[model samples]
Target: ETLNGGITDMLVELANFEKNVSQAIHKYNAYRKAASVIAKYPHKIKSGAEAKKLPGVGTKIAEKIDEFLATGKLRKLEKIRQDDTSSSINFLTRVTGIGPSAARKLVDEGIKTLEDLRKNEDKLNHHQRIGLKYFEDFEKRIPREEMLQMQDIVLNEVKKLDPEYIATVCGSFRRGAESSGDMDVLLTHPNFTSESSKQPKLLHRVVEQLQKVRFITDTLSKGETKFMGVCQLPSENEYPHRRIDIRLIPKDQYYCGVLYFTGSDIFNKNMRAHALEKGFTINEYTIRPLGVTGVAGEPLPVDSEQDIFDYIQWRYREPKDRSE
Candidate 1:
């Protein structure tokens, strides 16, 4: 049977874990690059040798695949699994801004658990200190129903301030996924025209309302078109606190924004990489033809998610399928 995208992602993560713990740089890169190709394969490889025929695969990596197929594990991955610190370091590194190097530092300092990191707060850097503070809340995935509630809260606030405002919740949630690691909400006023000159006023307004309601705790970053913060979901029964993120985009760039946020991050990365191979640079705002002349061609216009899919020539997989 052909391996699914989910299994490919696991292979990548396993490779990354091995790289970080053993400092196997080339091996890690080989696995990571091959994982990307496998995840986007329109058809599955029927055998280990068939998978090896893909770009980036080599003899050793192909053998690793054969090992996985035969024994359901790789010795390198199994070795990492045997060590608790390696797993903890890998898990903590998955937080948005934490890197492998940072995870190693934390592991060296005896911060092996989220609770351990919290207890020894003085050891963490400024960013990681904040990360540990909200670590538990951040890991708790937001349910679809709860994400809709967040969307409703922001939309109602926008509508109250300006009746013509447009709002959407994208990212994994938009693709009809049941849960999300973080909330990615996009906002724009109906009057906002171009991708340029749309100041940050609308974003500020929605954030202000959320702040007033005491739903949001810490502000990680803020700017004209983006607001990154920590939000606490209203508790229901026995569930604990939750984390969320909100972003705003100009009306003209709204569609690109939706596509980027509604991404399975792997899908987004692969799509952008494919676009780059075609001499186009894709960003949250637009996809523009690249150049060494330092002058970009006119950005391809997009007003809806379909427009983005069309420009990229993707079949527009549903949000639900985007996850796996």
Candidate 2:
């Protein structure tokens, strides 16, 4: 992930520029596709010509890369960054629940900054309002120490609810980052399998218990198997309110779910590319072999994260080693 960090970071801004400004979604997608390809590229891209050889890096994006390689900047991106309206949309979209379209719509309504958003509170949704309330707090990265403390509190509470339940905090924390943007918890139970009926109760039980202890403060959304919300450590620690998500996965999909969630995006992208090369298709739910006609075969049984790698003939990487 860090190999071409400079290029990918700029490309992301370029992608968002097309998305938030002109609403040119096709061009936006192209930039993102190229960025992902470049991110997963094994070596530093020395020239735009070399980049063009990659599947997603077409002439247009390659030229942009050439300009970046030579001048260390893209003219269009700099212009977008300087333009007040476009810049405002980018800023607004950073708030939870605000996408490029929503940000554009807000900018159209004359909302331009956090102060403007605060003044137009009546126009905002519950999720946006909550996002605004903790905008500064949410922007701060979670220190690994605090993340571990939060994990202890959450896992302890979850175990009390059901000894059979399994839970782990995924995302950058699982990848051993010194700090992470948010928390993602993958929960599973032995009783819930792919063959079993949907059990909303299992997910609700954990959410309610966390909410009761005041660990989970505000919920953005909740459903039969997923809860997206805000959580904080005990008041004595006085930690900032952090974004937390919990998903109840079937036992059969548990390891795959963990592998998907515990990702450095680059690592996952490269691994998926590798899986396809090996005649298998891997996803959060299952890994299956490819048929002669390129159709996916039956879902393979995966007991552990290592089993998934073994199926695809990939060398097993521990969670910490997954940070590309």
Candidate 3:
């Protein structure tokens, strides 16, 4: 797929050069816009000046493109890659809770490698500590079959709590991807309805029950509507510690939740843009009408994801076919 999209990698490097190296917002926007355009272009780019004919590509970017066309390399990116600090900063972003700024701080403090991070465990926050602990495991992809097995374990536990509880495995598995980065699960209980007001919500109870069973071992963050934590197979010796996210959405918003989480990101982006063009707003929570002033109105009652699609005039796509 990357091969099909000519100039994709080069344009992407240009984009990275803007945001990560030069730290120029306008350049980042320009390069990213050009990159998307180039990715969708039907023919291989033959000349730098040819691309400059396009709107987003400027003279400066075109000159760099010429260098790439002649040399088959992005020298700007090569220069950035040469910096040890830049390399270390880039590597630090692989950890879950370490953002660019935080990663920069660590780099500034002379924490130049994973070994440095390992020795300076005191510097990390709770989430960062967990991230560092499972860094390698976190980077590994979970095969589809493994996702199904994990889902079965979680679903069984959820149903035992309440048959009326709905548990869904969203993300790449739902989109028929061969593997996934993490498990995205949406859970809702009939007892916790949109109309109901109950203390100690079903979400908390379910999380507590799972914790007691040792299925859920740690918390990154827990709240009324969501749990982000670690879960592992009960069969002790075989499985890797995995990241799990369980979200409790209202039944009324359930299918919308399904649609949003089941997306391939680009599909979601296109869908939301279509919603806006048609004078509506779509999100994981609900689809709402836009007022005369362009503000969002009350969320329309949606029975299913199809209702949202139908409302926005999109033919409904099955989860498996939504891999775009």
Q: Pick the candidate with the highest TM-score.
A: 2
Candidate 1 off by > 4 Å: 1-80, 83-85, 94-97, 125-130, 190-198, 235-239, 265-283, 288-296, 309-324
Candidate 2 — which residues are off by over 4 angstroms?
A: 1-81
What would the per-residue lDDT of candidate 3 be over residues 68-156, giving only the tens digit for each residue?
77786777766755687888888898986799898999989998688888988888898888899988888788887777887888888
- Scored by Cα lDDT, where does model 1 land? 0.71
Candidate lDDT scores, in order, read 0.71, 0.87, 0.80
TM-score of 3: 0.72
RMSD of each: 11.9, 12.0, 9.6
Model 1 Cα displacement at 34 (Å)?
Answer: 31
Instruction: Tell me the tens digit of each residue's lDDT in model 1 across 121-200.
Output: 77665656777766666677778777787667776766777787787877667787777777677787755667356567
Q: lDDT score, residue 20, model 3? A: 72
Q: Report, for all candidates in order, the number of backbone clashes.
A: 4, 0, 0
Give the Å error, residue 17, model 2.
Answer: 14
Worst 10 residues of 2 by lDDT: 75-84
lDDT of 2 at 286: 87
